[PDB]
Design a protein around this motif. Structure first.
Motif, short mmCIF file in Angstrom:
data_model
loop_
_atom_site.label_atom_id
_atom_site.label_comp_id
_atom_site.label_asym_id
_atom_site.label_seq_id
_atom_site.Cartn_x
_atom_site.Cartn_y
_atom_site.Cartn_z
N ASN A 90 0.23 -1.29 -0.21
CA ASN A 90 -0.07 0.19 0.18
C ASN A 90 0.72 1.22 0.24
OD1 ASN A 90 -3.06 -0.65 -0.43
ND2 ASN A 90 -2.28 -1.56 1.61
N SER A 91 1.84 0.92 -0.56
CA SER A 91 3.19 2.37 -0.34
C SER A 91 3.17 2.73 -1.83
CB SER A 91 4.27 2.41 -0.14
OG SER A 91 4.41 1.36 1.70
N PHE A 92 4.17 4.28 -1.86
CA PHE A 92 4.00 4.99 -2.73
C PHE A 92 5.36 3.96 -3.41
CE2 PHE A 92 5.97 8.20 -5.15
CZ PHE A 92 5.21 8.55 -6.20
N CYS A 93 5.24 3.39 -4.93
CA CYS A 93 6.79 3.68 -5.49
C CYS A 93 7.15 4.33 -6.68
CB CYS A 93 6.70 2.06 -5.87
SG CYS A 93 5.24 1.14 -6.25
N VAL A 94 8.15 4.22 -7.43
CA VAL A 94 8.23 4.84 -8.50
C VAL A 94 9.74 4.46 -8.61
CG1 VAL A 94 9.43 7.19 -7.26
CG2 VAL A 94 8.83 7.15 -9.63
N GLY A 95 9.19 4.28 -10.61
CA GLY A 95 11.04 3.90 -10.99
C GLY A 95 11.21 4.65 -11.90
N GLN A 96 12.71 4.04 -12.05
CA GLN A 96 13.70 5.28 -12.88
C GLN A 96 14.05 4.68 -13.78
OE1 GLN A 96 15.61 7.67 -13.45
NE2 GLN A 96 17.90 7.39 -13.44
N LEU A 97 13.04 4.66 -14.96
CA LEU A 97 13.76 3.63 -16.63
C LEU A 97 14.21 4.76 -16.98
CD1 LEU A 97 14.20 1.22 -18.28
CD2 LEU A 97 12.06 1.48 -18.31
N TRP A 98 15.12 5.01 -17.69
CA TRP A 98 15.74 5.39 -18.71
C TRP A 98 16.66 4.82 -19.54
CZ3 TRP A 98 20.41 9.82 -17.24
CH2 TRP A 98 20.62 10.60 -18.51
N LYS A 99 15.81 4.43 -20.52
CA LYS A 99 16.34 3.57 -21.28
C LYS A 99 16.01 4.34 -22.89
CE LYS A 99 17.13 -1.27 -22.56
NZ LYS A 99 17.32 -2.56 -22.04
N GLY A 100 16.44 4.59 -23.94
CA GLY A 100 15.81 5.21 -24.70
C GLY A 100 15.35 3.93 -25.88
N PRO A 101 14.41 4.06 -26.90
CA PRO A 101 13.98 3.02 -27.95
C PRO A 101 15.24 2.63 -28.57
CG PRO A 101 12.36 5.24 -27.95
CD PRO A 101 13.75 5.88 -27.06
N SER A 102 16.56 3.32 -28.66
CA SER A 102 17.60 3.00 -29.55
C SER A 102 18.23 1.75 -29.11
CB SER A 102 18.28 4.11 -30.05
OG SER A 102 19.10 5.15 -29.16
N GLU A 103 18.23 1.60 -27.09
CA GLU A 103 19.35 0.52 -26.48
C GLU A 103 17.97 -0.10 -26.96
OE1 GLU A 103 20.73 2.81 -23.30
OE2 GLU A 103 19.82 4.34 -23.69
N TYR A 104 17.12 -1.21 -27.25
CA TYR A 104 16.60 -1.83 -27.51
C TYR A 104 17.34 -2.41 -28.77
CZ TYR A 104 14.24 -1.09 -23.47
OH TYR A 104 13.14 0.07 -22.07
N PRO A 105 17.31 -3.61 -28.66
CA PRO A 105 17.76 -5.30 -30.08
C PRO A 105 16.94 -4.16 -30.89
CG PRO A 105 16.97 -6.30 -27.96
CD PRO A 105 17.02 -4.66 -27.74
N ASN A 106 16.90 -4.31 -32.20
CA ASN A 106 15.69 -4.13 -33.59
C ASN A 106 14.74 -4.94 -33.80
OD1 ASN A 106 19.22 -3.34 -34.70
ND2 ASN A 106 17.68 -2.13 -35.59
N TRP A 107 15.39 -5.99 -33.16
CA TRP A 107 13.59 -7.19 -33.33
C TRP A 107 13.15 -6.77 -32.30
CZ3 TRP A 107 14.07 -9.16 -29.31
CH2 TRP A 107 15.29 -9.45 -28.10
N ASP A 108 13.70 -6.03 -30.93
CA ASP A 108 12.16 -5.64 -30.44
C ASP A 108 11.43 -5.04 -30.52
OD1 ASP A 108 11.64 -4.84 -27.71
OD2 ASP A 108 12.88 -5.98 -26.57
N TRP A 109 10.27 -4.88 -30.22
CA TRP A 109 9.11 -3.56 -30.43
C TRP A 109 9.20 -2.27 -29.83
CZ3 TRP A 109 5.76 -0.43 -27.02
CH2 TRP A 109 6.18 -1.64 -25.88
#
Ligand SMILES: OC[C@H]1O[C@H](O[C@H]2[C@H](O)[C@@H](O)[C@@H](O[C@H]3[C@H](O)[C@@H](O)[C@@H](O[C@H]4[C@H](O)[C@@H](O)[C@@H](O)O[C@@H]4CO)O[C@@H]3CO)O[C@@H]2CO)[C@H](O)[C@@H](O)[C@@H]1O
Ligand SMILES: [Ca+2]
Ligand SMILES: [Ca+2]
Length: 418
Positions: free
Chosen positions: A213-232
């Motif tokens: 029941n607490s608050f949470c926040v995730g730090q996701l710093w990863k742009g489209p170009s950092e995923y593999p090419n076959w990745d959506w």
């Protein structure tokens, strides 16, 4: 302080928080071992400023050190070696004092937790995980920055310090520490560090286990170009990438979509962060910010990190936007307490509260004027926000009787209330 889960079970704690980032990158260097005393003392002030929560630095002691040329760092908490709280920020005793003061003043304390890695090579530490038992990412074959059999996420740099957060014993260890933070250090929630480094689902497990029941926040710093090419995701918007993470972790997420538009688009493009999304299920999970300890400057040494700093000419516009719009806003310590934007931020917090603007409040953008012109539907009042605009009067874009609520920087910043 409303405290539910969203309609999609995301842990946004009511959708009405206003957060202070409780530190800047150079605190351990500028106020060595004194930070928790400073916060204890400022507790009343923070509460009076209008903050409902404070994002505390990593509580786990960090005595690391690094240097590459002119640049040096270490001890800030991102390369901790133990759960021991006697670190560079102050003593365990001071932490408890600080957390008590904050909590007393009505401010929730959110701790920054770093489950992805630890200072493996630190000679004197309380946690010693041997090699060969599947505790480490490198206990497995590590081709590149891709999930291996000992780590279902990316690695931190080389990956030699990456933990197998999925190993029953590693999971259980973090789990137990989260429960500790909540039961003895007054945690009201957590900021999950380097979320690209382990599965989203693990974060939901952890929250479920220790602080459902607490608050949470995730730090996701990863742009489209950092995923593999076959990745959506290689071809998706920044919004989709962070939204996807939030769907799985069941936690709000830092609006890197907004940050990227603030850095690369024009002010009118600001409407493209997650927080401007026409679907409330989308914008309500956004946790907006102007700068953080990585992206912005910090007083002291080297000007801090400043990896992706918003230029001073847009700071007021940037705060005006986040403070008056959907999502959950975060204020950077320095803008608030070091650089003089405090008075300006204070006013906006009051506008936000008076209007009843929350995480899921509707926002409409108006196409016929220059700059950014938006109509925000707060639960109490309607807001007309015109940033670097030619808009003449609030009635050109909204029905109702409006009073000027804010007018700063030669009219570049104007907010009217119904
Ligand atoms: O043993 C593993 C690795 O150790 C060595 O890595 C060094 C880096 O070279 C240093 O730059 C530094 O890293 C900092 C980083 O600079 C700093 O931004 C901070 O990063 C956080 C960030 O604040 C946070 O918001 C988040 O999202 O994630 C980041 C990681 O938690 O903290 C880092 C840790 O202090 O220090 C490390 C370790 O001392 C070595 O050079 C590598 O080859 C090796 O693989
Ligand atoms: Ca709340
Ligand atoms: Ca990892």
């Amino acid at each position: 302080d409303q405290a539910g889960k969203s309609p999609n079970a995301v842990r946004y704690h009511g959708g009405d928080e206003i957060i202070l980032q409780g530190f800047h990158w150079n605190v351990v260097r500028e106020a060595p071992n004194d930070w928790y005393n400073i916060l204890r003392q400022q507790a009343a002030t923070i509460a009076a400023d209008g903050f409902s929560a404070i994002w505390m630095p990593v509580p786990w002691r960090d005595f690391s050190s690094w240097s590459d040329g002119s640049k040096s760092g270490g001890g800030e908490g991102y390369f901790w070696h133990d759960f021991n709280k006697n670190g560079r920020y102050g003593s365990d005793a001071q932490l408890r004092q600080a957390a008590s003061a904050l909590g007393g003043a009505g401010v929730k304390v959110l701790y920054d937790v770093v489950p992805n890695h630890m200072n493996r090579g630190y000679p004197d530490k309380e946690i010693n995980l041997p090699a060969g038992q599947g505790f480490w990412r490198n206990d497995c074959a590590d081709p590149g920055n891709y999930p291996n059999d000992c780590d279902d996420g990316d690695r931190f740099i080389g990956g030699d310090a990456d933990l197998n957060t999925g190993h029953p014993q590693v999971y259980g260890m973090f789990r137990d520490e989260f429960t500790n933070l909540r039961s003895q250090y007054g945690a009201g929630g957590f900021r999950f560090d380097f979320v690209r480094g382990y599965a989203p689902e693990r974060v939901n497990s952890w929250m479920t286990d220790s602080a459902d029941n607490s608050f949470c926040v995730g730090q996701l710093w990863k742009g489209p170009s950092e995923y593999p090419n076959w990745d959506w995701r290689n071809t998706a918007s920044w919004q989709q990438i962070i939204k996807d993470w939030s769907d799985r972790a069941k936690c709000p997420v830092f609006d890197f979509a907004l940050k990227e538009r603030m850095q690369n688009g024009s002010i009118a493009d600001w409407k493209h962060g997650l927080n401007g999304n026409p679907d409330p299920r989308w914008r309500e999970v956004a946790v907006t910010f102007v700068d953080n300890h990585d992206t912005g400057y910090s007083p002291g040494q080297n000007g801090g990190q400043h990896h992706w700093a918003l230029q001073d000419g847009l700071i007021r516009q940037a705060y005006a936007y986040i403070l008056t719009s959907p999502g959950t806003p975060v204020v950077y310590w320095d803008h608030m307490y070091d650089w003089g934007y405090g008075d300006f931020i204070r006013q906006l917090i009051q506008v936000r509260r008076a209007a009843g603007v929350r995480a899921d409040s509707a926002i409409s953008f108006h196409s016929g004027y220059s700059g950014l012109v938006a109509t925000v539907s707060g639960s109490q009042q309607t807001l007309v926000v015109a940033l670097n605009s030619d808009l003449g009067n609030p009635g050109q874009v909204a029905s109702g009787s409006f009073s000027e609520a804010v007018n700063a920087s030669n009219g570049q910043v104007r907010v009217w209330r119904s």
